[PDB]
């Protein structure tokens, strides 16, 4: 157990994309593997399964003929070749260790890799510092207009986890908008620097907005 999948990216409908999964800590070669995804609607869907040796492969009809699960037992890596991508393939792809001797279900899942299948172009987010009516003090961060998902919004490089509420991104006509509130004490701000930070991988964006009083 410790499955790190990678390869998630925004692809155009009808395109191709390959996913990888680094398996470390266990004897990968002896384990049957699987790929399970979760649509934006939070729907869990089994995508594929491959035997330890790779001779036996299983796929649901909605995926068969377009997706191909294979593996490299030499370097301990699971793969998922996706082709003829459809909008319905938009989901978070989890690498799952299937079994050895018995059907114990899905015992170990990876942390996932997001695959977005859309015709919309990549748009970088606009981070805005939300001072209260700057004058316990609550602060906020506005990440408006970005595509696709996700974004990593953090406060003070992660050192500020207390009183943080990072809200789910809402889609405003092809562009998402996420918010986050950090509630600290009056002695912590504006006395100390609380930096409203954000990062968008798809655009290679890394913005650090400092919360300045009004």
């Amino acid at each position: 157990q410790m499955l790190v999948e990678s390869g998630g990216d925004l692809v155009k409908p009808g395109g191709s994309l390959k996913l990888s999964c680094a398996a470390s800590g266990f004897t990968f070669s002896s384990y049957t593997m699987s790929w399970v995804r979760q649509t934006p609607e939070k729907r869990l869907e089994w995508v594929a399964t491959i035997s330890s040796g790779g001779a036996y492969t299983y796929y649901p009809d909605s995926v068969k003929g377009r997706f191909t699960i294979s593996d490299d037992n030499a370097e301990s890596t699971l793969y998922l070749q996706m082709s003829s991508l459809r909008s319905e393939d938009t989901a978070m792809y989890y690498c799952v260790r299937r079994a050895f001797d018995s059907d114990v279900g899905f015992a170990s899942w990876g942390h996932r890799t997001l695959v977005t299948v859309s015709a919309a172009k990549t748009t970088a987010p606009s981070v805005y510092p939300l001072a209260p009516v700057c004058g316990s003090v609550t602060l906020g961060c506005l990440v408006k207009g970005y595509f696709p998902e996700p974004v990593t919004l953090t406060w003070n490089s992660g050192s500020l986890s207390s009183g943080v509420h990072t809200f789910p991104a809402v889609l405003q006509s092809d562009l998402y908008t996420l918010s986050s509130s950090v509630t600290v004490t009056s002695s912590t701000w504006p006395s100390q620097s609380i930096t409203c930070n954000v990062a968008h991988p798809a655009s290679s964006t890394k913005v650090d907005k400092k919360i300045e009083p009004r």
Binding site: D103, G105, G110, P129, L142, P168, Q172
Partner: protein, 216 residues
């Protein structure tokens, strides 16, 4: 294909009491006298976690609160008692027939005591005004139940257009919710008026929690 129909799409139970989640299969999930039904617990930002394998077998590491039962088509997941960290979405899954199928899931929420929202209004950022936009954010933190109401007032008027809302998942510790109301307007319309209000009507108080600012 085998379809899994889960009872209570969502269930609200008090801390200390038991919860019961059902999962009906359109076809038998049994094979060789064994039921290939599996239960999972998924918390926000994390992948599903195996709770029970094969209908009644408790996965190691999983607290005894969870138990499973059932055969053929009718299955049950029992959380007794329900703890604060048990808030999550539970899914059932069959592996008796290819393709493997999952249930729609059952979101479990705790019936915590009532709590009033902490409303905080935030005027448009100076940086955003340069872009020609003007979004007025309003954070309503730590409240219960989830059902709340936000009414924006621009110069006394009840602005209905351009309100993008978003609710967080119930907190795993204090069992409360948080909401963010955003009124998005252009800079020109934002500069046309002066007073901007964010009202929050909740069951904890008859009088709404009003938070406003005078544009300057």
């Amino acid at each position: 294909d085998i379809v899994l129909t889960q009872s209570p799409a969502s269930l609200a139970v008090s801390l200390g009491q038991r919860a019961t989640i059902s999962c009906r299969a359109s076809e038998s999930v049994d094979s060789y006298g064994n039921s290939f039904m599996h239960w999972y617990q998924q918390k926000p930002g994390q992948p599903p976690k195996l709770l029970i394998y094969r209908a009644s077998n408790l996965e190691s590491g999983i607290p005894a609160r969870f138990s499973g039962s059932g055969s053929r088509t009718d299955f049950t997941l029992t959380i007794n008692p329900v703890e604060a960290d048990d808030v999550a979405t539970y899914y059932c899954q069959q592996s008796n027939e290819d393709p493997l199928t999952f249930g729609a899931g059952t979101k479990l929420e705790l019936k915590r005591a009532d709590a009033a929202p902490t409303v905080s209004i935030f005027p448009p950022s100076s940086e955003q005004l340069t872009s020609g936009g003007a979004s007025v954010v309003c954070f309503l933190n730590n409240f219960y139940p989830k059902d709340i109401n936000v009414r924006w007032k621009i110069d006394g008027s009840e602005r209905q257009n351009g309100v993008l809302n978003s609710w967080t998942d119930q907190d795993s510790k204090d069992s409360t919710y948080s909401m963010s109301s955003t009124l998005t307007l252009t800079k020109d319309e934002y500069e046309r008026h002066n007073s901007y209000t964010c009202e929050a009507t909740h069951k904890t108080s008859t009088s709404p929690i009003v938070k406003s600012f005078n544009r300057a």
